[PDB]
RNA sequence: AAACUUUCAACAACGGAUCUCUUGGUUCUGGCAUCGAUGAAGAACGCAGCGAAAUGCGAUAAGUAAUGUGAAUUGCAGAAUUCCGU
RNA sequence: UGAGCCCGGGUCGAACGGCCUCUAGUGCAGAUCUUGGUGGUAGUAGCAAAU
RNA sequence: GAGACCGAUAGCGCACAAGUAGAGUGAUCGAAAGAUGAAAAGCACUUUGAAAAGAGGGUUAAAUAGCACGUGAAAUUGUUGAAAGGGAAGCGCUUGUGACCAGACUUGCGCCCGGCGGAUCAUCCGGUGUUCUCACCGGUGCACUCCGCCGGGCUCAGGCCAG
């Protein structure tokens, strides 16, 4: 029994992002979603063949929210003391070393994570093996 | 994983650069694309013919309808011009690369234009504006394949 | 304008750039006129050209390299030390297995634990004749074997050296060479290199197959005692007498602590009328090889090696005594541009 | 004022809180049985509290906080050594945490269980790492990586490998390293050498 | 903490005052420590640098190097001491600038003024040491 | 400049909030929850004698 | 099949956004009261080795006297110019 | 769900981030918007003015 | 002397030659423009040729930091590579083909036997701090107890997808 905690199957209603209308045609419009406010916009009027709109019905199961495909919840660590906070939660959470953590501090985080039994999502970033 | 196609060894390639040259950018692009992938002695003789009005370069992308003649039959194009200054500036950079090859120890009869490229220069701050260009080119030797010997049984 | 910075003496941009353009135009015209005046003077009298060329010479880092004033850390020419004694014992004593004749070699190539560089490790195994590749782990959840265990295994089953190819971002990154030796002597030195620019033979334009013939070795530019250790270590891995019928050549050339590895297929052709004679070393043209060139075709991977550590046994865990490590690369021995450990 | 402390701790500020976006909050205080910030497991907002900790020497202790030694922060905790036998340590929790909230008893037993399990895991990792003989060293610094990328291009230019190989090959043709009647060269070119 | 109203704890004014100082004020800024023998001989912490002071460099890439000061370039806040030279492209050795805070004074160039300088420092160092003591 | 920078607070409310801040200082876990390293002092008000 | 056209990637350009910096501005507060016929504020002409800008100065002209400090100025050409010294 | 957020690879060189509160010159596709930069037109019109 | 102000399209028009350049008969109008590097160490020398340009070679930690100089976005452009194109492209749902890229459960505990070493084991002794009954040292040994360690044997436990 060395894995994530037993969870329900991970079901995602949608995998495609909600692209903003006319973001394909104009380079000044980002793909981040904006609600169209025109009274005759086909996306707002919900015609067929048009881009869908975000709604609360697309929301994910609460027992599966914020959960990685492995079944662990992401936990941003910055040092060794952040790893020891997952001593009681080694099967619910996984350690994510931050992008600002240096090379030698990642060594101490990786060594402590293996001892505590927590997963690391970024375990081969600035490190290499020596024989 | 995948590995990109490596560059030819610098002992086989000679480079030459021209930056901030006061020639039309569009005429240089059509002249450089005409001589791409050629032997150096072909390219030099061709450019002296464009100066002497004997041969013409094709206008494909930046093709203002200025010249149609029988000199387009060599390319299959209906648009062919005679850029004099574009040929003069490109000759001076091929002769620079041939000189760089000679100092490096290359075989000057077997150079080919492996790569040639024309980019836009900063616009000259004078309502009328010029269109200068950067030009880079790499001259490499022709590939030499040696004969493999028969495998030994053992 | 070689002694004054214009940015600190003129406080305005647009005045500074206007003066620097006027300086560049003036200096380019003044330089061109000087060389053209120098040309016709040298044409009318060719003697001052010969005087000028041997007094003006382009500087090189190789001619400016710092030596010390042989103990595996001493940056000293072993070749010059021998000539000065005429006007190495320490290396042979510390490493008696490497320095009578080596037997027929036999090479085992493995990767790191759970490697994904099998095609690259098979290309390293194809480099050395009588080399076999065995994957280290054999599936993801299997037994993790240590390099000490594999060294004992290959020693017992009659192998002569072990090569471990470490990986990073699914590219080969480190080459660990473990000398197993023979009979009762323990497993020998462990030389660890770093691979920086690996290019397979498939990606190389105008490439070729390698035949099954044994290549001759060209170990170039190896002068310090550490480099003679690296030259000798590569020599045991290759067979002593090369099969010269197949013209293949493995080249390990050192240029300022970078060992460039190439593999070619030569042909002794004549010279084309546009080709030049092969100007050899010391600036002078070579004698006896007039009009004769050696054509080359790259058949092997391009890779650059840089030696980082020499161990006494098999790795750090495997080297026991007070001299467990023999040479280590720190970045402080490259502070000066001109010092090369070689 | 145990509730009034909790309202300040929960809803104004607590220096031990770590708010994550994953639907749970964490307490960084070292004397907490669970890492989570809730009413049951906040040691500051519970005058009576218990916690299981592990010493650097390897000893596992049980800590006790009472309402009487509350104004004295240096004397907050009674430290009791827990047995190395797993069953006697579980019983030692039950006798010492008698008449406590059952949350504290149940989570101290879990904290005892995870501490012993990590210690066994710690000894199995160290035994395998000693056998494997492999350590994680940091990779190259970006300053050093830019340094040898710059000097490799200058060394590759200085090496001039193809001319160096050609010069060395024709040198060994002259000295007769290939012997009389060489297999490397055709006969009419070996005649040109002499 | 500052308490006097006539002193300003402003980064703008301080960097202005340092880089626009006249040559007399720049002299005090380019002051150097005395060596341990020289401290125990004259009871002086630090004096400004002259043109004839034998000095030892303790900071930078020219560490543990001794020499005599050749010039005091007060404009760029730097001094030139003997034999620490760097070759240009042409081979012309230009002197390398060292800050006076990166050196330590081994020998002084004494005259009447320098003795008066060092007597005034040991006057005040002893006067308050006596005042602190008794 | 005639934006209202200073605000008028009742003196009764100011004296209320000070007396509440006094009482919170006598409460032990509120000290270590603010950030103070209170793990060595032997009493939370921690009076020192005037003679010292 | 090339050319041309579209999309994407790598490298190379054009351009100066973003991040960081600030001998600048802006706003407040405090001590004090001082232009000119004894020629002001402003305008101009000159003065240096190379001075183009700016600054300083007035045929005693990048300055003289006196006082204080105590060994420079400096991008290049200075002196037998001065170092227990008006 | 989303506005958005975290990590890897490269570049890069000196400062920055989370929490809880306070504050505001705080979120852009439009305004024949302002300033800058850059296109097709187009190597076209035509060599007039300007350079 | 200061600031819960602005930080080079902002803040005075002006961080810099700024009431400057320049326009207007004149009254008046009035800009744009900061950042090499720690240090010019600002590329000596060889070599093409007429240049605000290259190829070598050197300086520097770094020159893809070379007075076009910190970082260097987008629009727009060139080369290389892949795919497509019978009078529009772009977009939504769903496959498929190819290319490149990633790597799935961290992959374990419990019994039995034998040896070895430790202790929280001896109504063993001495000491220290303390919340005054709890901890921590030092020296004893292995009758008992309990931990590890090594060498065997055994047990179950597990992640995803199918039938
Ligand atoms: Zn809490």
XYZ file of C-alpha atoms and ligand atoms in Angstrom, chain D residues 9 27 37 42, ligand 1:
5
model
C -6.678 32.993 15.451
C -0.667 25.001 10.629
C -5.521 24.377 11.026
C -4.865 24.302 17.065
Zn -4.137 27.221 13.906
